[PDB]
Design a protein around this nucleic acid. Structure first.
Lengths: 260, 167, 134, 117
RNA sequence: AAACUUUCAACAACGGAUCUCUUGGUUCUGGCAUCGAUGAAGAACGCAGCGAAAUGCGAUAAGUAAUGUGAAUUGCAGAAUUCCGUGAAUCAUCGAAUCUUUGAACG
RNA sequence: UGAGCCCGGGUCGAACGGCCUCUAGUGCAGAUCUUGGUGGUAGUAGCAAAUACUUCAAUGAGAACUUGAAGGACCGAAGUGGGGAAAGGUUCCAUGUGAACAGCGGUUGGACAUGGGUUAGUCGAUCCUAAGCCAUAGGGAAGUUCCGUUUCAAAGGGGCACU
RNA sequence: GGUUUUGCGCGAGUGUUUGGGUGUAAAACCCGCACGCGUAAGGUGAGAGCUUCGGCGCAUCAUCGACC
RNA sequence: UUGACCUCGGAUCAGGUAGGAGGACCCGCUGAACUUAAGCAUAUCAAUAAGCGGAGGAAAAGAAACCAACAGGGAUUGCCCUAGUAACGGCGAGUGAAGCGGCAACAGCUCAAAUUUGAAAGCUGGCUUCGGCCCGCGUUGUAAUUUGGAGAGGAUGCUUUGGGCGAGGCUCCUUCUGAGUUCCCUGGAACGGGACGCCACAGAGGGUGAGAGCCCCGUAUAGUUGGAAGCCAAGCCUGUGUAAAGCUCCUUCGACGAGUCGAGUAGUUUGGGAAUGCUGCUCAAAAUGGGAGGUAAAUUUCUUCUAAAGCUAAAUACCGGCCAGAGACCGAUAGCGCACAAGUAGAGUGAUCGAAAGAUGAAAAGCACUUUGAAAAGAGGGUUAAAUAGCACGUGAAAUUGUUGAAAGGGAAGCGCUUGUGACCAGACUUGCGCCCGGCGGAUCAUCCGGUGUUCUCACCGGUGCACUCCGCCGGGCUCAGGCCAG
């Protein structure tokens, strides 16, 4: 409150009295009379630098940066070590860019949540779903009285085509904990890299995969970035016959003998 | 602030306001748009399905893919290029596609009952007495005064006669 | 989750409304499940509790004690069932308060008003059962 | 430049997404009252005044009385069929007259007019 | 040696820190427009079986009518309700009423 | 090395922590700092004047300061008497209690609790006007309102009559 | 609101977020026209580096330069 | 003499309306100083705070006496840039717009000036049997028509209609709509753990004796009962009067706001002496007129509008009103002064100033009874899972205090390095490996043959293997390595 700590009538007693030069509440029939006010050091006073609503809460990020980060997050989802490094139980599923038939996922059947649960165990996303269920527990701290009671792990992300799959996927899911749903036309880095960590387990549809090249072509003012290296395998680059034939003979070994 | 505290202490019920709006958000009634309107869709999405346009102005911002609702002379005169002092005033003379647009085309071109306008009883006797004395000589009835107290012109009386039935 | 904007998931607003409820709202809150025999008879799961009802306690230290309801103390959200009591120091028998969620109704006090309550709940269960079926 | 009391006059626009939803529901509301009609009136095509913007063109307020007559649209009927009329503007050249007559003709070709009651 | 003064431990005091809680506050957003001479906002005095305050009400006074729900209120006492009923309730809703002295205050 | 981290033992009863990033009302011996609590001083300084108290008995758990009686003193009608005005508001009376107040005590009190108590044609108010004050007629002032008190105000009483 | 340095994206361009279009609805995704800031020729002493070991020579300094 | 009209009065006449509150936002009036210019006086603060009047859900503004100089725009309002630009200030401190452009939202109208003059056609009352009866207002002007990018009047030929019911519909409150209290153990109590299920367009939230999707309220989606008020509306009845209306043409007309513009002066204000606006005083206009601009271009040539009357939704504001939903906010010295019978208790003559104070337990089950004491209370006994939870109540720190235990002390204590004494402790160790003899229990011994995989030559599985080979266990012996202090 802008008036917090300022709704009092206080004046300094003076500079000759053997008391601190702090404004004191006038009066004479109360505990409050003669007590210090108007200070960050004082009880029922005004804290230093009162918080104001013009505090720049939102951050402006370039659209090219966002599309770079979203493209980097999609590439890490195709990497099976990065999925295990995040905490996803990816061991019983094949083809870690998971693609499911759109015909098996469109219609009123998958609109029921029992068939959505049956589909997840059939393709191999089962143990990730039970991982989220068994991880729900109460949150440490003051967030419980501020609306954030529990917290749990994240699960698989279902990516579909709204035109071809038919938008009834969201109702079939959305009660299985951890499982999120996202259209291919609007991909979210907050879902793709939860907590800033790359490699989320994503379940695609056949329609979403075919449409993924079209939605990155339609981004205006953006092309897929070119890497500053061509081959990231440093083992093949160092131990190639081109480098090694040029190399000068070693001066020493990994560990050297103590001379004196 | 003090009034808000007074409600918390009081044993008087909190009068909850129902969320009423001044303007409705969906079409109503028994017509083609209200039966074909989708509440969960948007204005541009519904007008795409209907086949009509929603905004006649400039396209401000980018739209979804395929929304279809946001829109010799001897005398050197530009108007003769576009040609196809009195015009009709109350209507306009006019000359693979969605079903709602086809239904709207049939409703516009459905034939209309005429609801013809007749003449009053006293007007019929005034025209009858005019023919009974003068036959069909409209110039004489215009010059008459006892049977034409308002100096109606012979062109105007002839028009009223043709509406009446007697020439 | 919640969808409608009129609903609230606020913890303090939910707790304020529960502990400051009128006795009419407190009657709906103090509802108890029907027994298995009564459930297959009326197609009704739960009903608000009543002074003449017969209940069986299935939770607490007085488990499996069967008796007739004697009081519905809506101020402290408890019911009093006969013979489920404790003794004070003075040898005076005082009743123990049991929440209706810890009991199961095994017999109903039936009047014309209850019969409409069983009828109205039963009508909606077979409405959606037919809706889910055909 | 803080010599005045700027702290008591400072506006933060946290209702930016809220007012966007309010404006979109106001557009939806007038699409419900006028269900087959567009939510906007047809507007003429005019040239910007100054020498900096002579080459560019924009939408004006309303159609002139002369270009409304040459297209075959009566005066008292044009507001009833969704055409804005400006009695202040003047044609002043045949180029401004011909572009607006063609624009009114294209609106006539795409128009469906319902037969009164 | 005791006592006294000082140090440490244990237990007991003084005091209310820490931890956990919160029908409170603070800030943001959304829907709507509604005080009064038909007597407002505010001030006073009364009203409960047993009440001082807070709350509600006005000599019809912790309230009457009407509508809905459908069997309570509860700290104690006493009636209840015949329970197959114009129907309990410190219930909810609310379109009818009652409405002391003042206060723009108007013999 | 250190700021600190971890474990054992006792108490307690409902939520909490490691790791990588994000965020801030984020780290105290001082400010004659703020609020709250607690010491030594210290069982210390001190508990005045109005001359003055004593004996027996009763009550009570308990009597210098509660009562009865008897001695010794005092106010001395310009009272330490008997009544009012102003002001206070139940302090008045009875019964019961002795937690706190009455610089000691208390069975006592203007303390606390429960009950009770104020009876008018003749007593005062109520009626009248005094110094003075406010409306009303008018006139100022942007206005909240100011001047104005009989002022260039149609300002109010009473009667008579064959209708 | 200025300014210096480090990281990032795009680079003669750059800036989606005034607004509009979707949305699982204060998020995320997409974008029309404008607009802000910027943009519309060498030698010698050398000189990093390359070399077929004859010479090629970045940036930049001393100087000589060429132009607005 | 009587009767009109004009002006002015009376009535507790008939019927009405105003005052006060609220004032967050809005429209006006009035109007500072501190500060900065390291002092201060122009300036700035600031056309702000305080003071006064007046409205609404918005208010205000608003359909050009506008912007412009263009190939033109076209009422008002608000956002973005315009732009710290123009412009004005010792050309200091500094102050500081607007046009264009991109968006949000767009809606236009009402009078006075004209005679209905072949017909005051208009309206307030109040008496009604509700249909129409009178009393009046008003000709010093009430209806119809017209309101200058217009219009009138004639002629002319096409084109347009008005009322009353009203099914039904849309909003908004309302009833009803899923699945475990399954079996073990810990526990005072499962809402904990283990196993077995089930529902899910519902795994938001809350309560229930501990962390509950399936115990309960609710939660999701579509329906389904009953009701309120606005608005729309398929249709169904009627209409009517030579009634109204739009355009066209023209040998006919075409009225547009004065103590107001303007000049002079004073004060104030603005970026704005062509005075930027406003107000007072003095003088006081016009009709091919007046206003504001452009222009050296040869004379005020050209451009664009009509002031002194009036109304009007939206986009805009909002510390208040009736609610609703949220938060990387605070968590009882914090967050509003107020989580509590808080603007309370208390203080001041008064204007005003203005606190402190949350938590037993799941449930009061808040000590029956006995005993000591005048009583307060204490001790037994009892309630509870817990009296190490006694309404001086969750947990219960430090300062400071008491008791018990150990110790020290010839005019300070406290501190650093190093032994000693006394008290109390953490580790470490408890045996492991290998080999050789025996004795048991078993054939996952080597090889080969079939399938499978893989790193393509390595393995697994099944058989063959039948017992000088392989693996466990026990009983002896030997080696090596094992803790602390030392020679």
């Amino acid at each position: 409150s802008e008036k917090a700590g300022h709704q009092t009538s206080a004046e300094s007693w003076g500079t000759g009295r053997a008391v601190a030069r702090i404004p004191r509440v006038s009066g004479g029939g109360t505990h409050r009379a003669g007590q210090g006010a108007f200070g960050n050091m004082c009880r029922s006073g005004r804290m230093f630098a009162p918080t104001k609503i013009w505090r720049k809460w939102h951050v402006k990020i370039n659209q090219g940066q966002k599309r770079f980060a979203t493209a980097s997050a999609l590439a890490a989802s195709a990497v099976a070590p990065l999925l295990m490094a995040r905490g996803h139980q990816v061991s019983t599923v094949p083809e870690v860019p998971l693609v499911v038939d759109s015909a098996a996922v469109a219609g009123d059947a998958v609109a029921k949540t029992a068939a959505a649960y049956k589909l997840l165990k059939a393709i191999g996303a089962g143990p990730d779903v039970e991982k989220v269920k068994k991880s729900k527990k109460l949150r440490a701290g003051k967030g419980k009285m501020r609306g954030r009671r529990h917290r749990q792990r994240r699960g698989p992300l279902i990516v579909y085509s709204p035109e071809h799959d038919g938008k009834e996927l969201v109702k079939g899911f959305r009660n299985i904990p951890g499982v999120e749903t996202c259209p291919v036309d609007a991909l979210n880095l907050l879902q793709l890299a939860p907590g800033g960590h790359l490699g989320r387990f994503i379940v695609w549809t056949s329609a979403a995969i075919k449409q993924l090249d079209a939605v990155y072509e339609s981004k205006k003012g953006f092309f897929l970035p070119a890497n500053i290296v061509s081959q990231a395998d440093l083992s093949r680059l160092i131990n190639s016959t081109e480098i090694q034939s040029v190399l000068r003979a070693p001066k020493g070994e990994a560990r050297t003998k103590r001379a004196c | 602030r003090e009034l808000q505290k007074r409600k918390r202490r009081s044993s008087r019920p909190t009068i909850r306001m129902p969320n009423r709006r001044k303007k409705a958000l969906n079409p109503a009634g028994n017509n083609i748009i209200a039966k074909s309107w989708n509440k969960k869709e948007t204005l541009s999405q519904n007008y795409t399905r209907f086949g009509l346009v929603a905004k006649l102005g400039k396209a401000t911002g980018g739209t979804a893919p395929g929304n279809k609702a946001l829109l010799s002379e001897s005398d050197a005169v530009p108007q003769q290029q576009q040609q196809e002092n009195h015009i009709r005033q109350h209507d306009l003379e006019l000359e693979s596609k969605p079903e709602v647009l086809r239904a709207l085309e049939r409703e516009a071109t459905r034939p209309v009952e005429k609801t013809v306008r007749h003449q009053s009883e006293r007007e019929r006797e005034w025209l009858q007495r005019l023919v009974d004395k003068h036959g069909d000589d409209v110039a004489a009835m215009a010059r008459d005064r006892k049977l034409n107290p308002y100096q109606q012109t012979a062109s105007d009386i002839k028009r009223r006669l043709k509406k009446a039935g007697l020439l | 989750m919640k969808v409608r904007p009129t609903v609230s998931s606020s913890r303090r607003k939910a707790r304020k409304a529960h502990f400051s409820a009128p006795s009419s709202v407190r009657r709906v809150i103090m509802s108890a499940p029907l027994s298995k025999e009564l459930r297959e008879k009326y197609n009704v799961r739960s009903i608000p509790i009543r002074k003449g009802d017969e209940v069986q306690i299935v939770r607490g230290a007085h488990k499996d004690k069967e008796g007739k309801v004697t009081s519905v103390y809506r101020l402290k959200y408890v019911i009093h069932v006969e013979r489920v009591t404790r003794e004070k120091a003075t040898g005076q028998t005082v009743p123990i308060g049991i929440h209706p969620s810890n009991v199961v109704i095994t017999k109903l006090h039936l009047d014309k008003d209850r019969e409409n309550i069983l009828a109205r709940i039963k009508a909606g269960r077979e409405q959606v059962a037919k809706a889910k079926g055909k | 430049h803080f010599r005045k009391h700027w702290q008591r006059r400072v506006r933060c626009h946290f209702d930016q997404p809220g007012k966007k939803v309010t404006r979109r529901l106001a557009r939806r509301a007038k699409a419900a009252a006028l269900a087959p009609r567009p939510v906007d009136k047809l507007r003429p095509i005019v040239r910007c005044p100054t020498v900096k913007y002579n080459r560019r063109t924009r939408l004006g307020r309303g159609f002139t009385l002369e270009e409304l007559k040459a297209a075959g649209i009566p005066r008292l009927l044009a507001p009833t069929i969704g055409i804005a009329v400006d009695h202040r503007r003047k044609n002043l050249s045949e180029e401004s007259l011909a572009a607006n007559v063609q624009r009114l003709k294209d609106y006539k070709a795409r128009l469906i007019l319902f037969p009164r009651k």
